[PDB]
């Protein structure tokens, strides 16, 4: 790996500099190098890892959707044949996206998840595993599409089971997991009713636990509760 010669602390420092400069590809490469040092990640370092790759793949997904929309329009009735170029370029972006997802899933599998024993870290990584299988599912069309969808479901489900046993209902990692698993149900698994039920039940159970929280914890939890409410409003 190109980052093998750099100190772990220097990679963490440069990941933070890249975030400040909005250089998320650099940020992800630095955090990939940090993970490959083999030590477990701190809470802050987990956020650096997730922020970097969320921004990288987020840009790829946005571009893929633009190109996929153009491609679908070119395949409509009455459209002039433009050649293979739109499909080729959509495929290029799709392949790069899949490469990033495979990279993240590889870091989780070798060996972040198996060494994560605390509920907070294990749920965080399993949520990430569900997320990046979900991104693969968004572009999947082949023989393994159902297996990709079930890999996302399985990761999300294990994270949910741990989070319900080991974390309070206002825990922001538990809330963000539920938010994303709900979106998985709605957009990937064609289960809008399960999506709505999960978002509402997550919101209500967090609402009843807010009284236990400090002002700062309250702000964290209510911010994600608002995202659950936003989705429920979009879906109902």
């Amino acid at each position: 790996g190109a980052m093998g010669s750099m100190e772990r602390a220097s990679l963490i420092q440069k990941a933070k500099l890249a975030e400040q400069a909005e250089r998320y590809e650099d940020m992800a490469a630095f955090m990939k190098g940090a993970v490959e040092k083999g030590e477990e990640l701190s809470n802050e370092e987990r956020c650096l890892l997730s922020v970097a790759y969320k921004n990288v793949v987020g840009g790829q997904r946005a571009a893929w959707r633009v190109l996929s929309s153009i491609e679908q329009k070119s395949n409509e009735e009455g459209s002039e044949e433009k050649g293979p170029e739109v499909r080729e370029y959509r495929e290029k972006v799709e392949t790069e996206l899949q490469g990033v997802c495979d990279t993240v899933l590889g870091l989780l599998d070798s060996h972040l998840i198996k060494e994560a024993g605390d509920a907070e870290s294990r749920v965080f990584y399993l949520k990430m595993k569900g997320d990046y299988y979900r991104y693969l599912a968004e572009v999947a069309t082949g023989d393994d599409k159902k297996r990709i969808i079930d890999s996302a479901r399985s990761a999300y489900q294990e994270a949910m089971d741990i989070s319900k046993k080991e974390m309070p209902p206002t825990n922001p990692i538990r809330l963000g997991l539920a938010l994303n698993f709900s979106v998985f149900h709605y957009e990937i698994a064609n289960s809008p009713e399960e999506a709505i039920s999960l978002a509402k039940t997550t919101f209500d159970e967090a609402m009843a636990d807010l009284h236990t929280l400090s002002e700062d914890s309250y702000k964290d939890s209510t911010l994600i509760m608002q995202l659950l409410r936003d989705n429920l409003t979009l879906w109902t």
Binding site: D131, G176, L179, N180, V183, Y186, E187, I224, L227, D230, N231, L234, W235
Partner: peptide
């Protein structure tokens, strides 16, 4: 699109 974190 719906919100995810």
């Amino acid at each position: 699109f719906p919100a995810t974190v």
